UniProtKB/Swiss-Prot annotation, chains A, B:
It comes from Enterobacteria phage P21. The chain holds residues 1 to 54 of 182 of the full protein. This is Terminase, small subunit. Component of the terminase that processes and encapsidates viral genomes during virion assembly. The terminase is composed of two small and one large subunits. To initiate packaging, it binds a specific sequence, at the junction of adjacent viral genomes in the concatemeric DNA substrate. Next, in a reaction stimulated by the presence of proheads and ATP but not requiring ATP hydrolysis, the terminase creates two nicks at a specific site, one on each stand. Terminase then separates the cohesive ends in a reaction requiring ATP hydrolysis. Heterotrimer of two small and one large terminase subunits. The active complex may be composed of five heterotrimers. It is found in: Host cytoplasm. ATP binds at S31, K32, G33, S34, K35, G36. Belongs to the terminase small subunit family. The gene is 1.
Amino acid sequence: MKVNKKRLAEIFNVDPRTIERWQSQGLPCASKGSKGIESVFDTAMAIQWYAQRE
Amino acid sequence: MKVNKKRLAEIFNVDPRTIERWQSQGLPCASKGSKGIESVFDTAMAIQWYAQRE
């Protein structure tokens, strides 16, 4: 499902800054947050990403 | 974060049925539902488990 960074961080039980670390590592964010609009992530997509690194 | 079977299924973008099958393969439940009270899953616990599958 589509969530923002806050919810995404709340789902993975990590700090936002850790979520942003992952973003530098290629975790895709479906739509980059531009100018008063937040970045929106796909949760299954993020989970697939987390799962590949191991 | 604490979620119900429906919410967890939406996060993985899978059927509620899939969550039940994963529970049978060792996906941990923070609170097993029984009657009308409903199951509680831990999303972090869920993601670490899934990520240890492959």
